């Protein structure tokens, strides 16, 4: 229905066109009449008057009639109705030319369709009441439709130019019609003087004729002139309305004054022209459409829907704990962040997973109990009070940057931040991430874990080395290079490098003089020859070099004796030396799933050992000196090549854990009762080895 | 009607021009019928059949009646008026009728009309389809809507197969345009040539002197000038018509409309696999492009096979909802939550919305692609691939590398086995079913079994002829290897001695007929069943005493003719299952085994049942079914722990009353046998209930009714 | 009534040709009513009941009133103008009305109309049946569509038993075609033999000498020549009609339409058990094949019993 885009001028001109078509049809029907002109010759050859005998037949009179009709009657008086028909056909064709164009009609239908969707939508009067479930979803869908319309019609200007063209054509046609009709209306005369030279056929040369319907055609011409004058005045007003104000722009400033929303912008071009058209039809439509045009109103609708969907009771259901013993709210794939979430003030940790296009309001100042924030694959925005409060309060952060921009740039305005979990991925141009090297504003940062394909340690870490303490990096097959950035670590205490492809332990680790622990996880350490400088790490107690390729262990282990935790599980070690067990302070020694041939007896030196794992070895001989070491709390010798469990095993008083699983044993001795801290769980073995205890020993063992 | 979409702008313009031309024809026809005449006056002065043209002026007396004038008018109008000035409106009418017939021929000719109606109908239905709106926006799908989308998609495919064969519509449209332009040319030629013959003044020399008195007359044709301008206006319209036709002809010679490339739409839309239609499909698509490209845009997403796959996947998601899936949830042999998806097009995301699933079973799904949401299935440990080509991604591989410890792959082809399954970091249990020996693929399908360092169970139903050494390397942690080969002998060659951790070597249908030394060299083996291996003799039990852990010799389903008396040397077995054999008689030596808790001797040729069966105090189930056994000894009833006595289909004479010593009897089968009447002691057994006492009914009725009532009350209370 | 599927190209062509013959008849009838007159002038010089035709010329004076002229015109129009030139429009009216009656008799006659509508209804329902799409695609089947497919199957079997016994529709179409072709032959014969009698110049001899004074008059028939073109052009249309009808006759004598062979369709489709139908059903399947092959191919699947077994086991 295009009637909503037909103003009063268009309807008036259409009705005038219908009237002019009626006039033309009536004139043509009058032209159908056979008896048209009546001619009598001039100078023909109480008072009694006598008629003049012209001495002519009826056929001579008819011949004179047609001769004078063809050659003496003006062409206007004979073809005026046909000209009216042609002119009114042109007017009718060029009056719908804006409507019936291919590209214009689709835009018109789209505009009127979504405008009617507005005029029937509950969210319009709902939005006025906001200014002054299902319906919210339909509101959001219609809002996406409104944005689609903005990107779909506003670009072009075909409608306005086409309407201007058709109006100008109407005006010029009206001018031509008025001019020529007013010029030639004086030629429609009743009495005509015909001077055809048919003296040879009839006998006369001069005739006086009467055009019978000359009065009727004169009245029809004057009526058509009046109709065309009204049509042209209407078209001139159309031109005046088109050009007196710029219809290429429409200001929503009237709604800006009425509606409290000021984000409502001023659309232009075809949008503007069709808004002016519907304002000519009904001014309420544009005012109601404006509350759907603005996008801050869209943000308000999104917030209202966010608060409506998730009641606080649902958030009570969602409440849980996390890996750091904090009250966590897991929010998964959400449209945004509800204010109902911030209404909870007992909350200690926030988990936002792929909730993008999210702006953090001041309302987070409600919940003071936050300590952890999980901003996972979500591009988040911020507000000033939120910056201030999260500067003051937030300390633990765990973000995932699937996309580099999905890392927000505002993590670094804080200072109270202490823990950081930088899980994700990185590209080749590592040093260009200025986001990393802004942690100079962080003063309290102490935990940094970067699961990413990071090849070069940034100068960020170099700057923040003064207060940073823990590193956890998972490269996952990516080679780590540029280790001077880890050289200029000074106060760092923990270093866990996973899959960094570090062939050798760099001088970076030995430049560290206060490293509590080191992890060289998934790092291809074929040989260990740089341990000479490892003595500088006096704080080093943990050396978790597991799943590694250390083929043999040299004497350089004597450089550091403060070593306590020693994980060489799944190592390439063949034979242990005499020189490991000199460092008596070692308590925590791992060789799990290795392939050691045998255990030499120098193990007797490690008395302060509390953990000795050599599981899944090829060790066929356990000498009794490890059984002599009684401080050995854990001792895992599983799946080796040993033969018999030691009968004098009850001497180990403080033997908490003896994993000897899968060992080829024959019969358990009865002295497991003398062992104070060895269980069936502790002495994990195959069940045919479990079945071997004496009956009284079963009575003493089932009661422990 | 609905053919407005089929007619382009030029067709509408030609229709309007034809309407105006028909108005010309009607107006001229009415004027010719009613008012067309000649008004002829005789020439008084005639010089060689020519009007010679030679006080007060007076009229010429012709001395002719009105009827002689009418006769002269009719004769001169008939003879000396040109045929064009007379039959111009009728020629116009004929030309308009031919033009309208040519323009609307394909809408009336049935062969083209059927194709046009079919195309327009399915195109309008696809335009109005909600799946069109979903595709352009790309969900909530009503089942009427979903079935409409699937059925109409199939309709589109069938219509393409039905209409792509022929090109009749394009040929008919071409012929119509060519006729409409050649007739335009002929009309212009003959109309422009003869338009000057419509004259007002006409001289007629008709030779009717014997009837009138004059030979030459000078007529005036009144409806000439009007006719002239009508002809001019007609010519104008014809020119316009012709011009339009030429453009249409040019539009059908610029590009081959029988080859409509979907290039712009397939670049713009996500579905880039839209095939290029041909022939009448292409031509009608070009026409609908001329009308409105949005029609073709909305029809394009209904031809692409990527849209086939996406609509099929989303329809699959809409069919199989989470609730009926929870109803269909079952449990496997390991009492783990399993889901048997049989004959599915894909895996619905409702499966992946779960978090407690542990056994994801995928059976006969064609080339499915696993989305990452499997990582939500937090407890996932098993995975069953039966005739299913599986395609998986990296987060799925991560959650399976940290959680998944089982993988059950059944196949009949190499390509059914995916290449991802070798990248798991927690894989522990693994059954490969189907042939693994092929060209460049014999154990090289699965060469990534070195990467799996935590395997503990390996079942291979593969029709195998050799064992890889890499399995022997893995066997440091692997504890069970059961190879099913459907009657194919492997070459062991003592390459199995790295099975230090193997505990259950199960050679099913191996047809070995011999025991290699590697079987009794492996000290941790506890389960040994040489099933269907056709052992005529078993002679390798003596060397098993170095193996301290053997506890269960389930020697079943074999050709074993006799047991040597040296079997009495064993004591430590519990589940001695010697069923489905050809043992002539059970010996007393076999009852030297004191630790027997379970004894199955089903389907044997035992001559009788000796007394020493009662040497089995800890024995729980006993199945000497399908034997030749007549009496159970009292020693058997001193054993208090008999529970499952499958004694049926035997020749049992009677059960001695010392069976009253039995207490723990649970299940007994007596359909068969020769037991004349039930001893009441069979009713005495407490643990033996109606489900366990599978017994004849008449001998049960021989018992006193109150004992039956006590058993009934124990059953029902 | 959606009978367009029962009208092949010959039927549509003959309908349009009959419409244009209607227009000929109405136009010629209007002209013969309004302006068919005769202008008769007496032959002054008489030679044995015939016209002799023998400075400034002077008009011939007949000394006749205008009413004597009108009487002469009426008498020579009724007596001497040939009846073809007077009643050609009424004859073409009658002929094309009989042509329309022959075309639409099987549509208006209840015995054939009921069977035509019954067959058209089930053909249209089977053309839109989902089971047809599924089987031509050939198990997923909803209970409701399965019920409606089984109902349509039972309707197909019962209507096959109801219609395959008789052959009235084919017989009526045959009779209409023979009547149309023989009437084409008769019309062509008499119209071509009588078209030469439409003359502009007619000599009339009516013997009204006591009322007029003259015996022989020469008459002009103003609407003769136009009628001639009309007649000639009308003849052309009938020729086309006859030729079209001839093809129809040849088609209905090319092969026995009372036996329809599904041989091609049941060969190309999986179902090779499709039975050969007989009599009326065969004829209307042939007409539908002349309209569109796909309708017949789709209805072929509702007649085989292997498709019935497949539907039963899918429903089971
Ligand atoms: C497709 C083919 C179309 C042809 C079909 C023709 C239809 C009509 C044919 C039958 C016409 C019947 C009349 C025939 C004999 C004529 C009799 C006669 O001369 O009557 C006179 C009379 C004129 O009167 P005068 O004497 O001038 O009156 C002056 C005092 N007021 O002539 C007539 O017009 C005949 C009246 C019959 C009416 C039939 C239709 C007349 C034409 C109507 C045309 C109107 C169209 C207007 C629209 C044009 C622009 C859109
Ligand atoms: C743009 C503005 C146009 C300005 C004027 C346009 C006409 C220019 C006039 C040219 C001119 O004067 O030439 C005369 C010339 C001939 O005149 P005579 O009678 O010989 O002159 C006698 C001398 N007194 O007159 C004309 O050409 C008249 C102009 C055209 C008249 C009709 C135009 C349209 C004709 C088609 C009619 C269509 C009706 C169809 C009816 C449908 C019914 C079913
Ligand atoms: C391009 C093809 C052109 C076709 C026209 C051929 C014209 C050739 C001329 C033949 C000729 O000279 O014959 C004249 C002869 C008349 O003159 P006479 O007095 O016999 O001869 C005296 C000559 N002054 O005229 C003709 O034969 C011309 C033929 C014109 C055919 C026009 C066709 C008309 C068709 C009738 C359809 C009417 C249907 C109306 C429907 C009404 C709906 C309500």
Swiss-Prot record, chain A:
Ranges annotated as spanning the membrane: 8-33, 78-97, 164-185, 216-240
Catalytic activity: chloride(in) = chloride(out); iodide(out) = iodide(in); taurine(out) = taurine(in); 2',3'-cGAMP(out) = 2',3'-cGAMP(in)
Superkingdom of this protein's organism: Eukaryota
LRR repeat boundaries on the chain: 310-321, 322-344, 347-367, 368-389, 391-414, 416-438, 442-464, 467-487, 489-512, 514-536, 538-560, 561-583, 585-606, 607-629, 631-652, 653-675, 677-700
Effect caused by changing residue 58 to R: No effect on channel activity of the complex with LRRC8A
Tissue-specificity statement: Expressed at very low levels in adipose tissue.
Gene Ontology, cellular component aspect: endoplasmic reticulum; endoplasmic reticulum membrane; monoatomic ion channel complex; plasma membrane
PROSITE patterns in UniProt: LRR
UniProt-listed Pfam families: LRR_1, LRR_8, Pannexin_like
An MF annotation (GO) of this entry: volume-sensitive anion channel activity
Membrane topology qualifier: Multi-pass membrane protein
Record topological domains on the Extracellular side: 186-215
Binding partners and assembly: Heterohexamer; oligomerizes with other LRRC8 proteins (LRRC8A, LRRC8B, LRRC8D and/or LRRC8E) to form a heterohexamer. Homoheptamer; inactive, likely because it is not targeted to the plasma membrane in the absence of LRRC8A. In vivo, the subunit composition may depend primarily on expression levels, and heterooligomeric channels containing various proportions of the different LRRC8 proteins may coexist.
Protein name (record): Volume-regulated anion channel subunit LRRC8C
Organism: Mus musculus (Mouse)
Taxonomic lineage from the root: Eukaryota, Metazoa, Chordata, Craniata, Vertebrata
From Swiss-Prot, chain B:
Keyword Transmembrane annotated: yes
Record has Repressor as a keyword: no
Record comment: activity regulation: Inhibited by (4-[(2-butyl-6,7-dichloro-2-cyclopentyl-2,3-dihydro-1-oxo-1H-inden-5-yl)oxy]butanoic acid), which plugs the channel like a cork in a bottle by binding in the extracellular selectivity filter and sterically occluding ion conduction. Lipids may block conduction in closed heterohexameric channels.
Mode of membrane association: Multi-pass membrane protein
Disruption phenotype: Increased prenatal and postnatal mortality, growth retardation, and multiple tissue abnormalities. B-cell development is slightly impaired, without affecting B-cell function. Mice however show a cell-autonomous early block in thymocyte development and impairs peripheral T-cell expansion and function. Conditional deletion in germ cells leads to abnormal sperm and male infertility: the cytoplasm of late spermatids appears swollen, preventing reduction of the cytoplasm during further development into spermatozoa.
Disulfide bonds: 40-219, 43-51, 76-204
Post-translational modification: N-glycosylated.
An MF annotation (GO) of this entry: cyclic-GMP-AMP transmembrane transporter activity
Extracellular side: 34-86, 196-225
Tissue expression pattern: Ubiquitously expressed. High levels detected in the bone marrow; lower levels found in peripheral blood cells. Highly expressed in pancreatic beta cells.
Alphabetically ordered keywords of this record: Acetylation, Cell membrane, Differentiation, Disulfide bond, Glycoprotein, Ion channel, Ion transport, Leucine-rich repeat, Lysosome, Membrane, Phosphoprotein, Repeat, Spermatogenesis, Transmembrane, Transmembrane helix, Transport
Residue intervals annotated with topology Cytoplasmic: 251-717
Subunit structure: Heterohexamer; oligomerizes with other LRRC8 proteins (LRRC8B, LRRC8C, LRRC8D and/or LRRC8E) to form a heterohexamer. Can form homohexamers in vitro, but these have lower conductance than heterohexamers. In vivo, the subunit composition may depend primarily on expression levels, and heterooligomeric channels containing various proportions of the different LRRC8 proteins may coexist. Interact with GRB2. Interacts with NOX4; this interaction prevents the ubiquitin-mediated degradation of LRRC8A.
Protein family: Belongs to the LRRC8 family.
PANTHER family: PTHR48051, RAS SUPPRESSOR PROTEIN 1
Reported function: Essential component of the volume-regulated anion channel (VRAC, also named VSOAC channel), an anion channel required to maintain a constant cell volume in response to extracellular or intracellular osmotic changes. The VRAC channel conducts iodide better than chloride and can also conduct organic osmolytes like taurine. Mediates efflux of amino acids, such as aspartate and glutamate, in response to osmotic stress.
The protein's name: Volume-regulated anion channel subunit LRRC8A
Record organism: Mus musculus
């Amino acid at each position: 229905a295009f009637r909503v885009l037909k103003p009063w001028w268009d309807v008036f001109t259409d009705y005038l066109s219908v009237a002019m078509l009626m006039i033309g049809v009536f004139g043509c029907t009058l032209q159908v009449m056979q008896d048209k002109i009546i001619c009598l010759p001039k100078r023909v050859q109480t008072v009694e008057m006598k008629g003049l005998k012209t001495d002519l037949d009826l056929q001579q009179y008819s011949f004179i009639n047609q001769m004078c009709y063809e050659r003496a009657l003006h062409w206007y008086a004979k073809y005026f109705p046909y000209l009216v028909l042609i002119h009114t056909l042109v007017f009718m064709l060029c009056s719908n030319f804006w409507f019936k164009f291919p590209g214009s009609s689709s835009k018109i239908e789209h505009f009127i369709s979504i405008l009617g969707k507005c005029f029937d939508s509950p969210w319009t009067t709902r939005a006025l009441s906001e200014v002054s479930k299902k319906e919210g979803e339909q509101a959001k869908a219609l809002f996406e439709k409104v944005k689609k319309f903005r990107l779909h019609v506003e670009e072009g200007d075909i409608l306005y130019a086409m309407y201007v063209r058709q109006t100008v054509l109407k005006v010029i046609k009206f001018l031509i019609i008025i001019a020529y009709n007013s010029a030639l209306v004086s030629k429609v005369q009743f009495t005509v003087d015909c001077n055809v030279d048919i003296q040879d056929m009839t006998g006369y040369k001069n005739f006086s004729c009467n055009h019978t319907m000359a009065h009727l055609f004169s009245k029809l011409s004057f009526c058509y002139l009046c109709f065309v004058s009204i049509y042209g005045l209407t078209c001139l007003y159309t031109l005046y309305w088109l050009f007196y104000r710029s219809l290429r722009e429409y200001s929503f400033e009237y709604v800006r004054q009425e509606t409290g929303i000021d984000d409502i912008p001023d659309v232009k071009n075809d949008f503007a022209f069709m808004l002016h058209m519907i304002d000519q039809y009904d001014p309420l439509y544009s005012k109601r459409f404006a509350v759907f045009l603005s996008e801050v109103s869209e943000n308000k609708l999104k917030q209202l829907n966010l608060n409506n969907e998730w009641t606080p009771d649902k958030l009570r259901q969602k409440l849980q704990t996390n890996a750091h013993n904090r009250l966590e709210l897991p929010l998964i794939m959400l449209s945004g962040l509800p204010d109902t979430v911030f209404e909870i003030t007992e909350l200690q940790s926030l988990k936002l997973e792929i909730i993008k296009n999210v702006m953090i309001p001041a309302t987070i100042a409600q919940l003071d109990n936050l300590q952890e924030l999980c901003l996972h694959q979500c591009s988040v925005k911020i507000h000033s009070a939120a910056l201030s409060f999260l500067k003051e309060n937030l300390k633990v952060l765990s973000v995932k940057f699937d996309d580099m921009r999905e890392l927000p740039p505002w993590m670094y305005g804080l200072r109270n931040l202490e823990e950081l979990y930088l899980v994700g991925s990185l590209s080749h141009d590592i040093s260009k991430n200025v986001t990393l090297e802004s942690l100079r504003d962080l003063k309290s940062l102490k935990i940094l874990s970067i699961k990413s394909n990071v090849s070069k340690i940034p100068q960020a870490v170099v700057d923040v080395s003064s207060h940073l303490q823990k590193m956890c990096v998972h490269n996952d097959g990516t080679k780590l290079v540029m280790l001077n950035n880890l050289k200029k670590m000074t106060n760092l205490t923990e270093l866990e490098l996973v899959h960094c492809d570090l062939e050798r332990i760099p001088h970076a680790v030995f430049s560290l003089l206060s490293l509590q622990e080191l992890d060289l996880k998934e790092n291809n350490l074929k040989s260990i020859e740089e341990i000479v400088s490892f003595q500088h790490l006096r704080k080093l107690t943990v050396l978790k070099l597991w799943y590694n390729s250390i083929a043999y262990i040299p004497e350089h282990i004597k450089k550091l004796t403060s070593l306590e935790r020693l994980f060489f599980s799944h190592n390439k070690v063949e034979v242990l030396p005499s020189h490991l067990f000199l460092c008596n302070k070692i308590r925590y020694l791992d060789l799990s799933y290795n392939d050691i041939r045998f255990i030499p007896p120098e193990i007797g030196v490690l008395q302060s050992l509390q953990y000795f794992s050599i599981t899944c070895n090829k060790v066929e001989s356990l000498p009794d000196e490890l059984y002599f070491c009684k401080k050995l709390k854990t001792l895992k010798i599983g799946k080796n090549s040993l033969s018999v469990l030691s009968p004098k095993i009850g001497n180990l008083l403080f033997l908490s854990y003896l994993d000897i699983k899968g060992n080829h044993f024959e019969v358990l001795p009865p002295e497991l009762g003398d062992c104070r801290a060895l269980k069936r769980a502790g002495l994990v073995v195959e069940d045919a080895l479990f079945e071997t205890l004496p009956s009284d020993v079963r009575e003493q063992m089932k009661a422990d | 009607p609905a053919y407005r979409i089929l007619k382009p702008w030029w067709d509408v313009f030609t229709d309007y021009i034809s309407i105006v031309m028909l108005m010309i024809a009607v107006f001229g026809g009415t004027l010719q019928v009613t008012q067309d005449k000649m008004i002829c006056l005789p020439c008084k002065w005639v010089t060689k059949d020519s009007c010679n043209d030679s006080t007060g002026p007076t009229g010429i007396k012709y001395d002719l009646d009105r009827h002689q004038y009418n006769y002269v008018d009719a004769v001169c109008y008939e003879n000396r008026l040109h045929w064009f000035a007379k039959y111009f409106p009728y020629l116009v009418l004929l030309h308009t009728l031919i033009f309208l017939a040519c323009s609307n021929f394909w809408f009336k000719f049935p062969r083209t009309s059927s194709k046009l109606e079919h195309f327009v109908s399915i195109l309008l239905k696809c335009f109005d389809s909600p799946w069109t709106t979903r595709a352009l926006s790309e969900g909530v799908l009503d089942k009427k809507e979903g079935e409409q989308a699937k059925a109409l998609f199939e309709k589109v495919k069938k219509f393409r197969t039905h209409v792509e064969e022929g090109d009749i519509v394009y040929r008919l449209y071409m012929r119509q345009t060519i006729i409409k332009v050649i007739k335009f040319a002929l009309i212009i030629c003959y109309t422009v040539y003869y338009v000057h013959n419509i004259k007002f003044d006409v001289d007629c020399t008709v030779d009717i002197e014997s009837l009138t008195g004059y030979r030459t007359y000078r007529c005036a044709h009144p409806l000439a000038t009007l006719f002239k301008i009508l002809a001019s206006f007609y010519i104008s319209l014809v020119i316009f018509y012709g011009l339009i036709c030429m453009y249409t002809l040019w539009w059908m010679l610029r590009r081959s409309l029988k080859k409509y490339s979907f290039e712009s739409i397939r670049e713009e839309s996500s579905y880039s696999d839209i095939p290029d239609v041909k022939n009448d499909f292409a031509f009608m698509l070009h026409l609908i492009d001329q009308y409105d490209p949005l029609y073709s845009k909305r029809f394009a997403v209904f031809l692409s096979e990527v849209s086939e796959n996406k609509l099929r996947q989303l329809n699959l998601n809409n069919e199989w909802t989470l609730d009926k899936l929870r109803q269909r949830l079952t449990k496997n042999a390991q009492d783990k939550l399993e889901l048997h998806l049989f004959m599915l097009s894909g895996i619905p995301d409702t499966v992946f919305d779960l978090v407690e699933l542990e056994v994801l079973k995928l059976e006969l799904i064609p080339d499915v692609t696993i989305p990452p949401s499997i990582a939500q299935l937090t407890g996932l440990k098993e995975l069953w691939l039966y005739h299913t080509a599986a395609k998986i991604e990296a987060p799925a591989l991560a959650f399976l590398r940290e959680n998944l410890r089982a993988l059950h792959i059944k196949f009949t082809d190499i390509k059914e086995i995916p290449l991802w399954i070798y990248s798991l970091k927690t894989l522990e249990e693994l059954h490969l079913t189907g042939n693994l020996s092929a060209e460049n693929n014999r154990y090289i399908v699965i060469d990534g079994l070195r990467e799996l360092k935590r395997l503990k169970v390996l079942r291979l139903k593969s029709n195998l002829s050799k064992l890889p050494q890499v399995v022997t390397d893995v066997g440091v942690h692997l504890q069970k290897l059961s190879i099913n080969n459907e009657g194919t002998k492997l070459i062991v060659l003592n390459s199995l001695k790295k099975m230090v951790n193997l505990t259950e070597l199960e050679l099913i249908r191996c047809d070995l007929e011999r025991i290699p030394h590697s079987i009794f060299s492996l000290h941790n083996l506890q389960e040994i069943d040489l099933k269907d291996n056709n052992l005529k003799t078993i002679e390798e039990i003596i060397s098993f005493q170095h193996l301290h852990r053997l506890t269960c010799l389930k020697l079943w389903y074999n050709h074993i003719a006799y047991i040597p008396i040296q079997i009495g040397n064993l004591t430590n077995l519990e589940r001695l299952y010697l069923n489905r054999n050809k043992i002539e008689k059970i010996p007393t030596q076999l009852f030297y085994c004191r630790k027997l808790r379970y004894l199955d001797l089903s389907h044997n040729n035992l001559t009788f049942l000796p007394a020493d069966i009662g040497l089995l105090q800890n024995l729980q189930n006993l199945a000497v079914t399908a034997n030749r056994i007549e009496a159970l000894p009292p020693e058997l009833f001193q054993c208090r722990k008999l529970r499952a006595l499958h004694l049926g289909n035997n020749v049992l004479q009677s059960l001695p009353s010392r069976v009253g010593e039995l207490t723990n009897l649970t299940q007994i089968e007596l359909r068969g046998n020769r037991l004349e009447c039930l001893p009441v002691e069979l009713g005495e057994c407490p643990l033996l209930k109606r489900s366990g006492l599978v017994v004849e009914e008449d001998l049960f009725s021989t018992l006193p009714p109150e004992v039956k009532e006590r058993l009934w009350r124990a059953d029902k209370e």
